[model samples]
Target: SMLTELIASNRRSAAIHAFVDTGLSTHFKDGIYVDISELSRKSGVNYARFSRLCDFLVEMGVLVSNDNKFRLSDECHVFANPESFESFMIKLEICSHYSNAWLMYGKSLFEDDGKSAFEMAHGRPFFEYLDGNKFLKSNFDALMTRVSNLIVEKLLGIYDFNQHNRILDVGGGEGELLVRISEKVKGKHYAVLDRYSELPVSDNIDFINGNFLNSIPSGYDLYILKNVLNNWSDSDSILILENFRKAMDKNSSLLLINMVKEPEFSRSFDILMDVLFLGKERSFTEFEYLANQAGLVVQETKVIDQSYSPYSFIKLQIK
Candidate 1:
């Protein structure tokens, strides 16, 4: 009962925490029980509020209390005071650009129409909404760049880029992946084609500002659409694939670095992403059917460290 009550109200008054600003200091983290009077004086939060805060943390298992004094819980991980973890928590608190809007629209969003929750809530598509706001655009780009690093590490190692002398990253944002690939493996022509103009200017990357729905540059041996297609519906995804299919010759290849849906107990970001974006984290068979529609054939597939990353890649050739 206590656990359920605390869990239900975890975010209610938990954000009004004195400890979150700096977290538990080294003095309090030495396994010593901290009295509320001392915490009140130290934290400058009045005694009653400070005591209630400790009670909340104790119920949440982040801290333990005995005789109204508190100590950090052993079960609590080292998420407190850590920069990366703190930043992630902050993002969760404020909510990332897209996630915030999704929550605002509520469950009734689906009842409204065939419109995406993002479209219903903001009156614009997710990316289009982000396009006009410099702040959100920057934060989203940072989020993509971070995820791209995880992708680049796995992609470069397993996928044989050496087979292709020319490569293109369709919908590549900010050219971070291109820069990393060029740094590690040299002497291949590289380009990033996106609608955004904020990408870093690098001699190693030929940046092309263009739309992916209709046009794609020709003659690249390999084209990468990483974490891209799932943002669109099946028919629209085929439109994107068709663009590449039109540009690609028999020698060229298209690689989709995205999620392969698991029917058996798969959960996490991509599952939620599918609902938010009006998309699917497709199964291998699902991907096969989708690719076939755009005149492409799946040559092979690879799942890169499925535990940490939501990305799995399917390599395709012209059918």
Candidate 2:
């Protein structure tokens, strides 16, 4: 079925990530000419295995070779660097988790069984599993921070933080976004809400550990839900937003950080997420529905300039 193609794509992606991470891709960097034997001798990998890897890379278009010589493709120089290594690894991790579960128990998604693809794979929800393992929890936090780094600068450039007295990054992973913001602007108290404190102990961060679905801390004039809402269904997301709505002191604004689906944009990641977590990256109007249900009014929905890429910040307030 279609899921088979999906599985294949994920596996190929994971293989390519592993390939890039191996540092073998650097062999062809700067348009250097290479041969299988040279790569094998330099890496100390078996000649036959290295030859096979080179052939595979050629097929993948990461390289091209003739008469035992090879070089990186024109568009693949990016993989020659480690800049997007984390992003690729994260995507591979996500797909690996989903594909394994789907092959085993994904029928649950269409059946009467009430289990998510992640739960089916790991026998626990994604967040719950993440909470149990310190290493994994930390890695996931770092992954989010890495992804945020690519876009948060644009956020700082577009939004003004000087107006707020207190700010909370709800589900802020490792507080990187907040820390980045703090580095830019000062004199405001920053708080992070998560299950446990893995972020560095800082004077500015008042870390609060609790369930966002049930309750959140108070006395913040600005609340930020960055890439958090799309992890759950509408009802759960609504409950989370409702809790934030309740915790706010009437004037507090909620900033939602996410990439809204667009006609010109690619939804491949979002579509994969839809199958994996039943999560959705909403369109602007679709987001409004959630805000309306959560009893918040959309004050402004602007696409922050990425010069890097898209994803918007929707600012909301109480009616």
Candidate achieving the largest lDDT:
2
Model 2 lDDT per residue over 121-176, tens place = 78887778777766556556666777777776778777788999999999886777
Q: Residues 70-140, candidate 1: write the lDDT tens digits.
A: 77776443334333233333443345555655565566344645566666667777678778977766666
| Candidate 1 CA-lDDT value | 0.71
- TM-score, candidate 1, is 0.76
Candidate 1 residue pairs in backbone clash: none
lDDT agreement of model 2 with the native: 0.75
Please give me the total number of clashing residue pairs in predicted model 1: 0
- Give the clashing pairs for model 2: none
**lDDT per model vs. reference:** 0.71, 0.75
RMSD of 2: 3.5
